[PDB]
Amino acid sequence: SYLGGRDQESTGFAWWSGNARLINLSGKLLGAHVAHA
Amino acid sequence: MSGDAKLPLWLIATVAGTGVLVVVGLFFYGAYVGVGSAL
Amino acid sequence: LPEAYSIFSPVVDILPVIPVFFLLLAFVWQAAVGF
Amino acid sequence: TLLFQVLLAALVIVSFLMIVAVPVAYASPQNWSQSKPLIFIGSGLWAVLVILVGVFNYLV
Amino acid sequence: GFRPINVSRYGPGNMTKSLRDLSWFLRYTTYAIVAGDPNIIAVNVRGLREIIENACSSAATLVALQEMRRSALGYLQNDKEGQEIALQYFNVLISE
Amino acid sequence: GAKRLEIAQVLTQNAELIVSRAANRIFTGGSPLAFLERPEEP
Amino acid sequence: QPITYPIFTVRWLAVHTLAVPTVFFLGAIAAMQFIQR
Amino acid sequence: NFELIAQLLMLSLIVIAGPVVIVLLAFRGGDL
Amino acid sequence: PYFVVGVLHLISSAVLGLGGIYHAVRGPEVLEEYSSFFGYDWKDKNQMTNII
Amino acid sequence: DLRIVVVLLPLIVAGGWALFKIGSAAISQAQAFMK
C-alpha cells in the first residue's frame, strides 16, 4: 500500500532534514555509513 | 533543443555557482601573491 | 614526495579538497529533482 | 622505471573512469543486468593493476 | 514523479503477483500476433490500471511496458517486415 | 500467417530474457527475474 | 491560451544597475589581483 | 609555470567530473 | 613508512566506497527483512546490544 | 589618450550584441502603448 519512496509527502520530511527518510529504512542506512566511513 | 527553451535551472545553478566560487577563490589566491602579499 | 612517483606532485596536491566537493555535490543532486 | 609512468598513468585514467561509470551502472534498472558483470571486469582490472603497481614500487 | 520501487519495501508475496504479470503482458501479445487481431490485448487491458492502482504503481507500468516494447522490436531488426507488425501491436498495449 | 508464426517463434524463446530486461529498470534490490514463478513442464 | 510579457520594464533597469557595475568591477578586482609590486 | 598549470588542469578536470555523473543520470532516465 | 600508510588508506577508501553506493542505490531498502541477522527495529533491545 | 579607446571597445561590443540578437522584439515593444 505504501512504498512511496523519498519525497516530501510520503514521509513528512522535507529536502532538509535529509536523512530522516532513513530512520526506519535499515538497508540504506548501512549505505549511509559505509559511504561515510 | 526546445522542450522548454533551454537546459533547466539546476544545470545553470552549477556553472554560474562555480563561476562565483572560482572568483572568490581567485581572491584568496591573491592574498598570497601580488602587491598585498608581503612576499 | 617519493622520488619514483614524483610527477604526480600536481595531482596528489588537490586530493584533500575532494571531501568538500562531496558535500556540494549533494546540493546539486537535490537541485536536480525532488526539490 | 620508465614503465612507472605508463602503468600509473593508466591507473589514473581508469580510476577516473570509475568515479563516473559506477553510479551509471548502479543508477539504472534497465542496464543493471547487462552492466552488472562490467564491474567485475571493471574493478577486477583495477584490482590487479593496483597489485601490479605494488610490486613495481619495490622493484625500482 | 516516478521512482523505481524496492523489493524489500514491496513484499515477496506482493511481487510474485507482479512479476508473472510481466510475462503475461507479452504472452498475450504473442497470442494476439498469431491471432491476427489485437482485440485480446485491447480487451484485457481496459481498466487493469484502475484495478491495480492501489497496489502497483501506475507510473512504473508504463515505463516497464515501453521498454518491453523497445527491447522486443530490437529483436526483430533482422526480418525488417514483422517489426512494423509488432510495433502496431505493442502500441495497442501501450495506448490501452 | 507464416510470417506471423515466425514473430511468435522469435518471442517464445526470448520471453525469459525479455522480462529480465523489463523488470530490471523498475526493481532495484533483488534479481526479480529469478524471483518469478514460471509454469513448469511436466 | 498564452500570455506575452514585456521585455524591458522598470525592473530591467533596476536589476542591471548594480549588476553592470558589478561584473565590470568583478573584472577590475581580478585584474588588480594578478599584477604585483 | 608548467607544474602549476598542470595542477590547475588536474583540479579542473576533477570538479565538473562530479556533476557529469548527475546530468548523465538525469538525461538517460536513470532513477536519481 | 609514512607514504605506504596513506596509500593503504587511499586504496581502502575505494572498496569502502563501493559498499556505500551498492547499499544506498542497488541494494535492498529493507535491511532487516533478510536472513535474520542485521536490520533490527531499534526496539528489540536484545538485538541492539549485539551491535554494540 | 589612446587607452580610453581600448577600454570602451568591450563596452561597445556589449551593446553591439544587444542590437542584433533581441532588438526585433524591442521595436515591437517600442510599438507598444500606442507611442
Ligand code: CLA
Ligand atoms: C554524528 C553526527 C550526526 C548525525 C549522524 C545526525 C543525524 C541527523 N541529523 Mg543532525 N546534527 C548533529 C549531529 C548529527 N546528526 C549536530 C551535532 C548538529 C548541530 C550542528 C546537528 C543538527 C541538525 C539539524 C540542524 C537537524 C538535524 C537533523 C538530523 C537528521 C537528518 C539529517 C539531514 O537531513 O541533514 C541535513 C543536512 C543539511 C541541511 C546540510 C547542511 C550543511 C551545513 C550547513 C554545513 C555546515 C558547514 C560545513 C562545515 C561546511 C563548511 C564548508 C566551508 C568551505 C565553509 C539525521 C537523523 C534534523 C532532524 O531532527 O531530523 C530528524 C534537523 O532538523 N541535525
Ligand code: CLA
Ligand atoms: C556524508 C554525506 C551523506 C551521505 C553518505 C548520504 C547518503 C544518502 N542520502 Mg543524503 N544528504 C546529505 C549527505 C549525505 N547523504 C546532505 C548533506 C543532505 C542535505 C542536502 C542530504 C539529503 C538527502 C535527502 C533529502 C535524501 C538523502 C538520501 C540519501 C540515501 C540514498 C541516496 C539516494 O537514493 O539517491 C541516489 C543518488 C544518485 C543515484 C545520484 C548519483 C550520485 C552518486 C551515487 C554519488 C557518488 C558518486 C561517487 C563520486 C563515485 C564514487 C567512486 C566509486 C569508485 C566508489 C543515501 C544513504 C535519500 C534517502 O533517504 O533515500 C531514500 C533522501 O531522500 N539525503
Ligand code: CLA
Ligand atoms: C569523528 C568523525 C566524524 C563525525 C562524527 C562526523 C559527523 C558528521 N558528518 Mg562528517 N566527516 C568527517 C568526520 C566526521 N564527521 C571527516 C574526517 C570527513 C572528511 C573530511 C567528513 C566529511 C563529511 C561530509 C562531506 C559530510 C559529513 C557529514 C556529516 C554529518 C552526518 C549526517 C548529517 O547529514 O548530519 C546533518 C548535519 C547538519 C545539519 C549540520 C552539522 C554541522 C556539523 C556540526 C559541522 C561539522 C560537520 C562534520 C562533522 C565535519 C565535516 C567537514 C566538512 C567536510 C564539511 C555529521 C555531522 C554530512 C553533513 O551533514 O555535512 C555537514 C556531509 O555531507 N562529513
Ligand code: CLA
Ligand atoms: C559496515 C559494513 C557492512 C555491513 C554490516 C554489511 C552488511 C551486509 N552486506 Mg555488505 N558490503 C560492505 C560493507 C558492509 N556490508 C562493503 C564495504 C562492500 C563493498 C565491498 C559490501 C558489499 C556487499 C555485497 C556485494 C553484498 C553485501 C551483502 C551484505 C549483507 C549480507 C552479508 C552476508 O551474507 O555476507 C556474507 C559474508 C561473508 C562471506 C564473510 C566475508 C567477510 C569478509 C570479506 C572478510 C574480512 C573481514 C574483516 C577482516 C573484518 C575486519 C575489517 C577490517 C579490514 C577493518 C549484509 C547486510 C550482500 C547483500 O546485500 O545481499 C544481497 C551482498 O551480496 N555486501
Ligand code: HEM
Ligand atoms: C550591458 C550588459 C548587458 C546586456 C546587454 C544585457 C542584456 C539583457 C537582455 C537583453 C535582457 C532581456 C532578456 C530577454 O528578454 O531576452 C536582460 C535581462 C536580464 N539580465 Fe541582462 N544584460 C546585461 C547585463 C547584465 C548583467 C551584468 C547581469 C547580471 C549577471 C544581467 C542579468 C540579467 C537578468 C537577471 C535579467 C532578467 C531581468 C528581467 O528581465 O526582469 N544582465 N539582459
Ligand SMILES: CC1=C(/C=C/C(C)=C/C=C/C(C)=C/C=C/C=C(C)/C=C/C=C(C)/C=C/C2=C(C)CCCC2(C)C)C(C)(C)CCC1
Ligand atoms: C561485508 C562484511 C563486513 C565488512 C567488511 C569490510 C568493511 C572489509 C574491508 C576490507 C578492506 C578495507 C579491504 C581493503 C583492501 C585493500 C588492499 C588489499 C590494498 C592493497 C594494496 C596493496 C597490497 C599495494 C600497495 C602499494 C601500492 C599501491 C604501491 C605503493 C607500495 C604499496 C606496496 C604499499 C562485516 C565485517 C562488517 C560483516 C561481514 C561481511
Ligand SMILES: CC1=C(/C=C/C(C)=C\C=C/C(C)=C/C=C/C=C(C)/C=C/C=C(C)/C=C/C2=C(C)CCCC2(C)C)C(C)(C)CCC1
Ligand atoms: C552553493 C550551491 C550550489 C553550487 C554548488 C557548486 C558551486 C558546486 C557543486 C558541486 C560540485 C562541483 C561537486 C564536485 C564533486 C566532485 C566529485 C564527487 C569527485 C569525485 C572524484 C573523485 C572522488 C576522485 C577520484 C580520483 C582520485 C581518488 C585521485 C586520482 C584522480 C581520480 C579522478 C582518479 C547550487 C547553486 C548549485 C545549489 C545550491 C547550493
Ligand SMILES: [Ca+2]
Ligand atoms: Ca601531488
